[PDB]
Amino acid sequence: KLKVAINGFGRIGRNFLRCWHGRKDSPLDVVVVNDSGGVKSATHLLKYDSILGTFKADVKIIDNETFSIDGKPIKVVSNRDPLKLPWAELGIDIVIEGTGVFVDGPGAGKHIQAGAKKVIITAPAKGSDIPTYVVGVNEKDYGHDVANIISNASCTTNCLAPFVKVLDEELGIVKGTMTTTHSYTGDQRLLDASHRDLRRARAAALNIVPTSTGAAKAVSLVLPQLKGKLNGIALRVPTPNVSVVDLVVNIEKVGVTAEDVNNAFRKAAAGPLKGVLDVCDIPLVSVDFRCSDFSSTIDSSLTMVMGGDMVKVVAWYDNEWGYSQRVVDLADLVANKWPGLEGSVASGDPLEDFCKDNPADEECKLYE
Amino acid sequence: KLKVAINGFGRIGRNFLRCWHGRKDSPLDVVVVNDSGGVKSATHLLKYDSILGTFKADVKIIDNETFSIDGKPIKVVSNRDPLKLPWAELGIDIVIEGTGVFVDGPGAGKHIQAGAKKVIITAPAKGSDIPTYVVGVNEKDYGHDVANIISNASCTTNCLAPFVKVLDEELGIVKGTMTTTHSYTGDQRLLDASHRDLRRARAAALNIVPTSTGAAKAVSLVLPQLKGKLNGIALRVPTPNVSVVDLVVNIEKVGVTAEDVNNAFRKAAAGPLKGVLDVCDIPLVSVDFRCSDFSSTIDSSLTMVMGGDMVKVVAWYDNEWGYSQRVVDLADLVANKWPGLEGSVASGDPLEDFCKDNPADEECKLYE
Amino acid sequence: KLKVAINGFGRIGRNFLRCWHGRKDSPLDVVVINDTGGVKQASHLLKYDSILGTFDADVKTAGDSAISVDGKVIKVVSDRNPVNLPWGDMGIDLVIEGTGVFVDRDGAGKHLQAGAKKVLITAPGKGDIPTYVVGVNEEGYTHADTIISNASCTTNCLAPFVKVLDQKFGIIKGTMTTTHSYTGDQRLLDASHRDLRRARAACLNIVPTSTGAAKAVALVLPNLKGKLNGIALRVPTPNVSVVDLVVQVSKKTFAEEVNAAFRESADNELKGILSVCDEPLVSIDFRCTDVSSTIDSSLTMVMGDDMVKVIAWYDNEWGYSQRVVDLADIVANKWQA
Amino acid sequence: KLKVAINGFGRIGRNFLRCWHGRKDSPLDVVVINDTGGVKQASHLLKYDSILGTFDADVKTAGDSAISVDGKVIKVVSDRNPVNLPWGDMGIDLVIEGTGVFVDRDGAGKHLQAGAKKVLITAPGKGDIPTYVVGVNEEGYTHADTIISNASCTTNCLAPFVKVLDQKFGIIKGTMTTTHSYTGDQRLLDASHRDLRRARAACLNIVPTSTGAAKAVALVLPNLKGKLNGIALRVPTPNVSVVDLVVQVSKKTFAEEVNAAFRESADNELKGILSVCDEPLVSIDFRCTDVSSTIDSSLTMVMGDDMVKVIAWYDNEWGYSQRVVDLADIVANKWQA
Numbered sequence A, B: 001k002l003k004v005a006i007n008g009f010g011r012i013g014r015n016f017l018r019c020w021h022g023r024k025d026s027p028l029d030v031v032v033v034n035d036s037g038g039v040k041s042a043t044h045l046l047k048y049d050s051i052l053g054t055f056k057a058d059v060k061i062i063d064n065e066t067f068s069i070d071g072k073p074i075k076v077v078s079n080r081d082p083l084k085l086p087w088a089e090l091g092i093d094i095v096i097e098g099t100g101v102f103v104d105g106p107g108a109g110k111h112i113q114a115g116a117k118k119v120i121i122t123a124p125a126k127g128s129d130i131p132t133y134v135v136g137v138n139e140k141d142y143g144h145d146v147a148n149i150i151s152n153a154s155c156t157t158n159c160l161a162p163f164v165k166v167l168d169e170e171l172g173i174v175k176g177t178m179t180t181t182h183s184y185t186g187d188q189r190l191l192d193a194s195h196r197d198l199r200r201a202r203a204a205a206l207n208i209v210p211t212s213t214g215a216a217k218a219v220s221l222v223l224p225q226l227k228g229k230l231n232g233i234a235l236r237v238p239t240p241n242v243s244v245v246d247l248v249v250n251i252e253k254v255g256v257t258a259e260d261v262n263n264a265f266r267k268a269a270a271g272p273l274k275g276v277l278d279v280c281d282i283p284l285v286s287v288d289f290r291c292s293d294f295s296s297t298i299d300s301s302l303t304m305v306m307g308g309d310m311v312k313v314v315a316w317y318d319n320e321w322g323y324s325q326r327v328v329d330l331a332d333l334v335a336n337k338w339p340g341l342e343g344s345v346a347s348g349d350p351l352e353d354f355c356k357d358n359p360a361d362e363e364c365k366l367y368e
Numbered sequence C, D: 001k002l003k004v005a006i007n008g009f010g011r012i013g014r015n016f017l018r019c020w021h022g023r024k025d026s027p028l029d030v031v032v033i034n035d036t037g038g039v040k041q042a043s044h045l046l047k048y049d050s051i052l053g054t055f056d057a058d059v060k061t062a063g064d065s066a067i068s069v070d071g072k073v074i075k076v077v078s079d080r081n082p083v084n085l086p087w088g089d090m091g092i093d094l095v096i097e098g099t100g101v102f103v104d105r106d107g108a109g110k111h112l113q114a115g116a117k118k119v120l121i122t123a124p125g126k127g128d129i130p131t132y133v134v135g136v137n138e139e140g141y142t143h144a145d146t147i148i149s150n151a152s153c154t155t156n157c158l159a160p161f162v163k164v165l166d167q168k169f170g171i172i173k174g175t176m177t178t179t180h181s182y183t184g185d186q187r188l189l190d191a192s193h194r195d196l197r198r199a200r201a202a203c204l205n206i207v208p209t210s211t212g213a214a215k216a217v218a219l220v221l222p223n224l225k226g227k228l229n230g231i232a233l234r235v236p237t238p239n240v241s242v243v244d245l246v247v248q249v250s251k252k253t254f255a256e257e258v259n260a261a262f263r264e265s266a267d268n269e270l271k272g273i274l275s276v277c278d279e280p281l282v283s284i285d286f287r288c289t290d291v292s293s294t295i296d297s298s299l300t301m302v303m304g305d306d307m308v309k310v311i312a313w314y315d316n317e318w319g320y321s322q323r324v325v326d327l328a329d330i331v332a333n334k335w336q337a
């Protein structure tokens, strides 16, 4: 229903049709993506992932910029600038930021006016302005058609958060710090390649870099009532795709065991935190969750407490797959969040309605 | 000074062997191992390492029992049971428990039996008597020839202790944990194959092994002053031989930054932890920790605190090489901590030590 | 219906297990299996795989003695001696020895001893086995071989096409090599193993070697011997591997000439067995893939119409099992015994 | 002594620099670099290496404008203009453009066009550059030759002895391949690479491709073309690669005979250039070692005495530099142009 597309083409640009096409409830539909590499690539790209396997889908090569997806077609863009991208002509209600360079809704805005009704932010954008959008926490608490460029915090936190959310929610926690296992990726070069950062410079899949996580702050960004109580380090580690943190947390509460909280997990995971929060029982590893979309994988057993209160709290998780499911999260939400129907103002009383047309009304020059 | 053997050709045995031959002034001298695998193989193995490469010193293969360590003719055995292998015939002062197989001192007893006058345990504790001995921490706290079957725990503890010991000593540890992604080894399975720990039963450098480690609490077995403050799991992962932990525990003192404590760690790393720790502010990664002579190494720059109390201790270490020095650290300490046949203070002459040296009876040594 | 237990419940154990679920029409009533490893481990091991992922096949078992999975409840014990491994308690139909440590017919005999009926060995048995392999030794194959073997995936895969090439173009000389993966056959660490190379860790190092391929080719191909000889290259990968061979073929030809020829074969017979294409596909593109190997069409160069490089990503593990599975059920059929 | 700058300066350049230092009496006074990267980085680029570990030499920068290594001041310019890079403030003698993007003489000339005077590239100089490799063409190289390049490490590495190959027996046909490592040039993570193979992430997949080894083979030795031509395989490794080549030699022989015929090669020419043995060694046991490879004399098996296997863990990285650093010294030598 909702007109969708992707800014650029990434592995997350590779991520979601796997979900989306594999999805069964997606109202919206992508119709185009900026693969500046050709469908042949894009297909070979999208049809064949590196981790989740070949796309189990007849995503086929109709015309070099308009291919097929098991019969459903989708156009392709090939460019690295919003302004030429005719999201207007494309009518795209919702586009996914795939440059990263848009750490700013502004640059994403360069598509909004270009006919992006709304813009799917994907990563932690250095532009703070956008309300910090995270499922289980603030997902609904987002305001539809209010600054339609829609944030999406780091999977690491974005997965950690609902869990990280439930804990203090279950407990109340003085504060917290942690370290995930940031899988090896491209951002850190396979080679010791010239980098704006010493860390991701190095040859990737051998060295293991601890690094910066505003995602830690992003907790406060999504858990304002939990502001400041957050910390941790971004340990870039050599895996294909799974990260997992144990979170050091001085729990504000008594200091009862975790299994209780894990029962509360077993409550809340089975509660709203389905889809994201799993507490499996068999102690299992990265593979055991690949292609599995339970966007958080806690181990009750492995998780421990120190003083009963300082809880050593772990959770396996992928870094893009679950993240790719965060796509659908607001997607179907923002879809129903989309008005569709009309408004009930009074262009006499709410002459702003009349002014929405008659914007050059002295009757309307508010704050200006 | 001290003829030395090993429980088989431990990997770290080869590692320390690389050290051994390159070691500065080893009073002791290893002259035999157990290779039930062909000397040429073990030699090659000893010669050719993967991690630090082959030896830059040509050990030469004299006969299948005794090759020559660049001339130094070192023997070998072929077995897994000492009881038929008389280090007595070898006069081996200390056999080293390079495996863990005789996880029990009594198991190692078979070797004091088999001709050892002392024994070094390359293993953390299993029973009680374990001569829990961390150089820097409790090195000098060895009673001369007290418990000749002497224990060096894994760096998981061995490397882990001093700064931690120092940390409380410097800042006051209340309760908490560290954790490292630990290297991959054979103690975890190559691939998904038989092993009790499902985790250590899988393909490791393609996964993570979040698993219990009493070492995380065995620090008390050398720092009991800090008993009850300890937790932590390791994570065997795609690293050859290196790791780095972060003891994030609520600290007793104020809650100031770490760097300050690390400035004193900069003192301590040069202090009691000289040749042991290294507070290297340069953000450096595993490769930058190869041939880790220093038993530990710290990055203050990233070392920090969340609420002050908990300490984001950023500090690294090899897991075997440095340990292979803790081998010598303890060992040549024990060389001092055990004057062998060099007995310049006999007292077994006109003083009762004669009969004891001669033969116990209702005599000089008519003990309890 | 085939009351079967395999020895050495390795990946291939799981593979054929998964293949049992994967391959349809399985008379392979493999209600038991052997691996001296811990069975509940093996269960979880069966339950949880790395490459083809965990075998999501949920299994409910009551008691250590009885285990049930996907309806087909399947026993398994852990032991070394096939005589200490009772087979007559089920009157075992077939065994395959994934251990490799029983690389001679005696263990199979010892398996036949405790009450087994038929045996084959995925691994090339040292000495006392005429191996059976599809495409090569499945035609003259007799179900009446209570003990037989397969060869390594390498041979188990490299066989047919070049034989058919030998059929359709002949080969003066063949220089076969593989991107042979790593396994328990080699030491994870630099642990003490007979082959120094297999002894080494080699987390990123290959092993220059030679599997039984250039040897089993003798059996499986009574023609192609010596002239048609290469070696193996055991690589530091866990997964689907690639063939790397250059032949000096007999009849003058060129690249595509063999391709459609190689195509048509799979278009009829190497269907399921093998494959061929030129769409660039990497390892991940071959998870749980059964057509043992698609041969590259481009880089399969041809020099002097005899010097012909050949290249094909092959499933050393699952497609091997596939091939292992292939005649396995075949001997289940024509069930003379 | 020879004022040198390095464009696209990288690992192999860093290697060359770790070489340069290891090259005691390095007649290249390489006081200049082009590298768009940061200085401390560029320091760490040389200072902190993965493979050979950090540069065993301390790096000091005063303060950010210039960095001094081994007591010698060094510069690193950064501008994507193939000329603006001030090679003239010194009037650079030799330039090494790492980027390789100027496979045409132009960019290198563009480098010369503001002070630089000589060139060698990791990229095979397509056309308008002398096919110049040590062992093969560094000699026929007259120092008047200014802008030359090196072809693939593979090409670079195979060159000397593969020349010696047809020397001692003559080669009917030859189809070579490499165990080429993984790099960032192939997409280390899935990105827009022309080669769909080199486009994925494929930290554990191989890349069918070819190389100037298949091409400069003629350019380095005339008859060595087509029949003497193979492909490339970028493999999941970081380090010293191996030659996957079987030479269909002319003169009948057995393996060691050619290795005997190649003992001498190390004994006379490959000395420093290449090596050979049969003790099993792996890439790490080839690390930072300048003899471009050692040939698996054993597993360089003979088959039909014409189609003869060739196998050698070859220094795709360090010797590659070294050989170029050698070639650099060669051009540091005979200095007229």
Ligand SMILES: NC(=O)c1ccc[n+]([C@@H]2O[C@H](COP(=O)([O-])OP(=O)(O)OC[C@H]3O[C@@H](n4cnc5c(N)ncnc54)[C@H](O)[C@@H]3O)[C@@H](O)[C@H]2O)c1
Residues within 6 Å of the ligand: A007, A008, A009, A010, A011, A012, A013, A014, A015, A034, A035, A036, A079, A080, A081, A098, A099, A100, A122, A123, A124, A154, A155, A156, A186, A187, A319, A320, A323, D190, D191, D192
């Ligand atoms: N997965 C996470 O949790 C997370 C968090 C923060 C940031 N990120 C980054 O944000 C991106 C999202 O992941 P991904 O699956 O898309 O992998 P990805 O790296 O392939 O996505 C971005 C890539 O798309 C391409 N790109 C950028 N702009 C483009 C344009 N105009 N046209 C065509 N291509 C363009 C580039 O290759 C870029 O590297 C990634 O760069 C990821 O590294 C991810």
Ligand SMILES: NC(=O)c1ccc[n+]([C@@H]2O[C@H](COP(=O)([O-])OP(=O)(O)OC[C@H]3O[C@@H](n4cnc5c(N)ncnc54)[C@H](O)[C@@H]3O)[C@@H](O)[C@H]2O)c1
Residues within 6 Å of the ligand: A360, A365, A367, A368
């Ligand atoms: N002067 C300021 O600092 C400032 C700045 C921003 C807003 N405002 C408030 O908002 C309005 C803008 O103020 P201003 O400083 O720009 O002076 P202004 O009010 O003169 O700017 C608007 C002028 O442009 C024309 N105009 C109005 N709407 C137009 C439209 N759609 N298209 C073309 N022309 C249009 C009119 O001639 C008008 O005089 C004012 O009503 C003011 O009250 C003032």
Ligand SMILES: NC(=O)c1ccc[n+]([C@@H]2O[C@H](COP(=O)([O-])OP(=O)(O)OC[C@H]3O[C@@H](n4cnc5c(N)ncnc54)[C@H](O)[C@@H]3O)[C@@H](O)[C@H]2O)c1
Residues within 6 Å of the ligand: B007, B008, B009, B010, B011, B012, B013, B034, B079, B080, B081, B098, B099, B100, B101, B122, B123, B154, B185, B186, B187, B319, B320, B321, B323, B324, C189, C191, C192
């Ligand atoms: N890497 C270290 O620093 C270190 C030190 C001590 C213990 N450990 C742990 O315990 C194991 C041994 O330590 P390692 O580093 O030397 O690796 P390792 O496993 O290679 O050392 C044991 C080696 O000695 C031989 N061995 C094993 N059991 C034997 C026995 N009963 N009798 C004779 N020889 C035997 C084998 O060759 C084996 O490789 C390791 O697998 C590791 O998990 C590690």
Ligand SMILES: NC(=O)c1ccc[n+]([C@@H]2O[C@H](COP(=O)([O-])OP(=O)(O)OC[C@H]3O[C@@H](n4cnc5c(N)ncnc54)[C@H](O)[C@@H]3O)[C@@H](O)[C@H]2O)c1
Residues within 6 Å of the ligand: B192, B193, B194, C007, C008, C009, C010, C011, C012, C013, C034, C035, C036, C037, C079, C080, C081, C098, C099, C100, C101, C122, C123, C124, C151, C152, C153, C154, C183, C184, C185, C186, C211, C316, C317, C320
């Ligand atoms: N293509 C080849 O080269 C080839 C062919 C056949 C077999 N193999 C070997 O056999 C295995 C085939 O692949 P896989 O997925 O099954 O891996 P795998 O190693 O897990 O299979 C071997 C299994 O046999 C078990 N084992 C060892 N000794 C045993 C014994 N006495 N009794 C019972 N079980 C025993 C092992 O624990 C293992 O589970 C590999 O280990 C491989 O090394 C290789």
Ligand SMILES: NC(=O)c1ccc[n+]([C@@H]2O[C@H](COP(=O)([O-])OP(=O)(O)OC[C@H]3O[C@@H](n4cnc5c(N)ncnc54)[C@H](O)[C@@H]3O)[C@@H](O)[C@H]2O)c1
Residues within 6 Å of the ligand: D007, D008, D009, D010, D011, D012, D013, D014, D034, D035, D036, D037, D078, D079, D080, D098, D099, D100, D122, D123, D151, D152, D153, D154, D183, D185, D316, D317, D320
């Ligand atoms: N080592 C080999 O065997 C081999 C063989 C053939 C080609 N190459 C190419 O050479 C590179 C490896 O050599 P290296 O270890 O010296 O590192 P390197 O990767 O830094 O050398 C070349 C790099 O220069 C970079 N570049 C482009 N413009 C630049 C600029 N203004 N300034 C600085 N760099 C710029 C390119 O990205 C290129 O990858 C790889 O890029 C590889 O693709 C290597």
